[PDB]
Structures are given as C-alpha cells and as structure tokens.
Amino acid sequence: GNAACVIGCIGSCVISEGIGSLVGTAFXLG
C-alpha cells in the first residue's frame, strides 16, 4: 500500500459505498 492509496481511502468508502471504510483502504492497491 503506497502513500497515495492512504489518501484515496479517505474518500474511497464513499465513492465505493462499501460495508466499511476499513475495507476501502484495500482499493488503494488496485
């Protein structure tokens, strides 16, 4: 997980509308 993914995870759970933001941090990868 790069530093860029961390910043994205901050607003990934919203655009992804997943179960939990904690899981959105994984999207940072792919």
Side-chain angles (χ1 to χ4, degrees), residues 2 6-11 13 15-16 18 20-21 23-24 27 29-30:
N2 206 4
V6 179
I7 302 168
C9 269
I10 302 169
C13 270
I15 303 171
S16 201
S21 177
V23 185
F27 202 66
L29 282 160

